[PDB]
Amino acid sequence: LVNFQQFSSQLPPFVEVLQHLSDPSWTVTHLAVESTENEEGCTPLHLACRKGDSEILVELVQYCHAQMDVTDNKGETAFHYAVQGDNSQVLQLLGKNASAGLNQVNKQGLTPLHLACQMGKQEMVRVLLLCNARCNVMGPSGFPIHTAMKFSQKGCAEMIISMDSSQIHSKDPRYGASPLHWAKNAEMARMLLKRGCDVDSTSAAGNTALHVAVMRNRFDCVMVLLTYGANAGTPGEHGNTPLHLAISKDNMEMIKALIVFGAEVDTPNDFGETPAFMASKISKQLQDLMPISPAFILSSMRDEKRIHDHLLCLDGGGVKGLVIIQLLIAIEKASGVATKDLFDWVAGTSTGGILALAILHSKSMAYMRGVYFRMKDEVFRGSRPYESGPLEEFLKREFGEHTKMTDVKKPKVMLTGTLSDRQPAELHLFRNYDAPEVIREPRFNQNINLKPPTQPADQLVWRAARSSGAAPTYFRPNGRFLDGGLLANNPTLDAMTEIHEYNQDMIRKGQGNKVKKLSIVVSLGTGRSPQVPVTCKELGKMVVDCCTDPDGRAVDRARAWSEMVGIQYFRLNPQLGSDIMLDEVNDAVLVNALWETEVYIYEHREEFQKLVQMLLSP
Amino acid sequence: LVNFQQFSSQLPPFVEVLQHLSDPSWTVTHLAVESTENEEGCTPLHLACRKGDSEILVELVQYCHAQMDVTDNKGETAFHYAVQGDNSQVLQLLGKNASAGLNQVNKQGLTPLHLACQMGKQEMVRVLLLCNARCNVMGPSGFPIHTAMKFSQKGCAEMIISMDSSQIHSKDPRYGASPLHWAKNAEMARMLLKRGCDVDSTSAAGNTALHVAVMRNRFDCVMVLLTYGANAGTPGEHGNTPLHLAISKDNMEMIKALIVFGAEVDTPNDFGETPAFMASKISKQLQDLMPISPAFILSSMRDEKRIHDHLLCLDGGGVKGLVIIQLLIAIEKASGVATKDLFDWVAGTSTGGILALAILHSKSMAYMRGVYFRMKDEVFRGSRPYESGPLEEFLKREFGEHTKMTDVKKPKVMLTGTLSDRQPAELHLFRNYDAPEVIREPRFNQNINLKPPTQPADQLVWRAARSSGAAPTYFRPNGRFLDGGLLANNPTLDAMTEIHEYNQDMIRKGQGNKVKKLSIVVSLGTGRSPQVPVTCKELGKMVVDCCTDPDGRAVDRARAWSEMVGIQYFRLNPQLGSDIMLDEVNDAVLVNALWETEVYIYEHREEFQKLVQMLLSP
């Protein structure tokens, strides 16, 4: 031991630090940082790159003769010996002339990109990307973008895709694949899908991404894909539609999730195996599960000017609005004639506000199901109250920041809203035809105290959509208006009031070719929770339960009054089996609820034929 | 000084307060208490009665020579030298043989009764009355009870009336008065009126009790009397209704008070002087305030079994129910046709619940105004929450502890109420016909959810009145039910739904004798607050304002739907000038609000006449 330290000092001419060099063979130029070599397989420039010493690096290559592209006996190069540390500037001083180690890579064939992907060193990835690191360098498991996702390093993958858009193209060399396909995590599916990613990019064999999520039993990504437009029923490798691949499991959640989003149940694979056959083989659960779906010439209906008048009444509600979407869809398909072109009047309160306002602008219905599924995650991030940046601006984008209300008027539409500007707390109908000016009874004005009122006539679609759609027991103070759920929450009863008011405005004006009788009124409710006894804040919040309950008397009133006039009130909503609350964002229970709704449509399925019958008659 | 104390010691043979007893001439037999006389107007036996020395009293007449019936130098007797003290047993020891002093009376005429009544020695009044004190002895101000009341001694008057109910009969000899008339104090009017005191008591001239209260300008007692049933407009002395007696003053508070409680303005006195004439003579306030300035053959109408059907819908509300009473009364008087006999159907929610239930049992409307004025002080003694002992027990009294609901069916009636037994929080109508057997669609049960709760058949008037009328934001948990203000709170919509439901049950049952189209529905609301702007717990309570709004859209809805059917909805209620709250007990503000209502009736002389016109039409 004495001779070792004698040589150590006799080098030191060329304390507990460097003593730990014993606890082992450095050299003068090697340990001079704490083009020579080591007995463990190292290099001095590599250690001065690793330890984040940048001026010592300036003093090792610019001052001394030490070539930069040094490859040790362990595979590594000078570039990716620094990304194990935290320098990020050594990379900049090494990205110079006569230094080609960027594509020189053999740990196991893992380019500096891939190593920075394995660890999580994102800033290192950016530093490499500004220096043209050639993400078109095929690796062991695939290209560098796939390496970021094999390990689920979020920041690194995000930086890669931000610098290079083209990386949404690259295919996994083993199986021709998208970045999504062989890379699955609930959040990552979204953080790539929001980027404009095609989900139907297929495969080597032909397997979709949701095929991969289903085969591995990750319900999360099945949902993330169906929401963002993935199409169930894709044949794939063996003609096994994603439905076959779920029945091969015991995941009823996923089977119902796919059946809701449109998968057929008789479609056979390449071998002829129908998925209902699969079901009856596996369990009796699934065979009982799958009985989901004739003069169908659609006799005498279009969007034209003739006798009667159809009304649609979309209640407010939570994210539960999806229920009515489903209902609408099964009506829309049971007549085939595109809900918007089916009804002459359409009214909505809160989520039905958003939805009615949408089906005015010629937005399709499954598309809207997707929209809510994509929005529930952005909007309901909060404790109880939400600052509405997400909801307001999501509507800005979804309907247009400059699109004003009365630009469309294809069917007449009305969104509710509680004008909380006044202690009276009146109701404002957001309307897009003109206005009903009738009769001559201003009950609060025309006497003194007070006339600073506003009522902004008819503009700014997104602004009205927010002023309607926020059930404010949840959101916040929201400008001048709160939900029309504070007063109406179920326009069914109130929209007929507006019908007759506007008709008397028309007639009084001598117009006289008013569209006559509301021949049909159809009110869709976002489901009913089940009936719990209460043998008793649960004694101070029942005020709000009553104030916004749409499925109590506001059915009986409207119905008996429709029977007074000749209307055939048609109230549609399913008994769910759960207290699905308004701001529910676990889409597992939301999908279960959509299945609940479709079971309701199945169980009735007669009322629907009779309603379509009425809706298309002469 | 030496001689005075010499006589004091020579008396001490005939212990430190005797010098200050000297300083003015007592004697041996005189000061032997602290049959001689005095130089200040006194007597020894009188002092042995005054000082409450009973054993000295036994030792002054039985042992010593002291006649009992000694009259002092200022008129007073031995009896009412003791009621200046507080013995009350010496009186009985003097209520013995050779003692006729009960009617021994001369201060200026002050019976033992009158002295004990003027001072307040109530126990003395009782002791004398138990000893046959012969109250038919005119004193200075009338009889002894009137002497008790000229000085407003409650204990004494109450004791007199306890011994003799007959003393609420006796008239002031000078003018002839119930104990009311020549005896005025706000509280005593009540503690005498609650005893069964008749207001129909006349005067010498013929003056009512409120005549004395008004001419003397004691607004307190005017209110206390109009409250307990006094009838303004009694002609009285000169044909001067108590209204004439206010206009000669400048007390507008009282003028409004009398016109509200029914005083006319066409009523001439003996001289032909209309009271509005008095006004225009007196002031320009009063000239503008009062004056009013003919098919009255009652053509072809009663309440029998014929074509159409009338409905009445009395909103809920606070103690403000008086408003609708006022309206009803001013409607009733404009037709003369006795509300119960005028409408075939009647619905009520909270105060209108009690009120409709009252007009069902043929309890008159002025009577209900009185009832509320007498009850409001009893029920609302609490800060926010009230334990309902007063309300529940007041209904027990006012409607009968054993009177069951369906004893009447005179007009069909329905009271609202929120059945809080269930998390759905349904609505139950307390009904008295039988029940409407719905189209057989019970959509909330039949998925066997629960059958341990019960839907309690038609019984128990007072219990239902409470289960409806108890606003639980104010009162308490109230059994299974809360206010009908959480629900309908303006039954008009729900009452018409129920009308039609019952009519279709009738027709469905093969009856074929439908009563009819309800040709008229009249909705009377407990006033409107004035319109307050809001530029902002006032955002957690505005939820409740919305939930219980009876004058917002539930007017427009009902109205436009009646225009669908042919009904001529009649919404009647006044713009108050104030936010009169629920548990308001200052009857001054309630009276101002009734004046607001009567001004509303003034301006609406067209609507009311048209409503009565239809109410009696073919």
Numbering used by the authors:
A (entry chain B), B (entry chain A): 81 to 94, 104 to 112, 118 to 128, 146 to 404, 409 to 651, 671 to 752
Sentences from the paper on this structure:
The sequence can be divided into three parts: the N-terminal domain, the ankyrin repeat (AR) domain (ANK) and the catalytic domain (CAT). The lipid hydrolysis is executed by a Ser-Asp catalytic dyad in close spatial proximity to a glycine-rich motif.
The electron density map reveals nine ARs in the structure of SH-iPLA2β, instead of the previously predicted eight. The crystallographic asymmetric unit is formed by a dimer of iPLA2β. In contrast with the original hypothesis of ANK-mediated oligomerization, this dimer is formed through CAT domains. CAT domains interact through an extended, largely hydrophobic dimerization interface with a contact area of ~2,800 Å2 formed by three α-helices, several loops, including the long loop 554–570, and a part of the central β-sheet. Importantly, the active sites are in the immediate vicinity of the dimerization interface and in close spatial proximity to each other. By contrast, in iPLA2β, the active site cavity is wide open and can accommodate phospholipids with long polyunasturated fatty acid chains. In the crystal structure, it wraps around the CAT domain towards the predicted membrane-interacting surface. A single anomalous peak was consistently found near Trp293 of AR6.
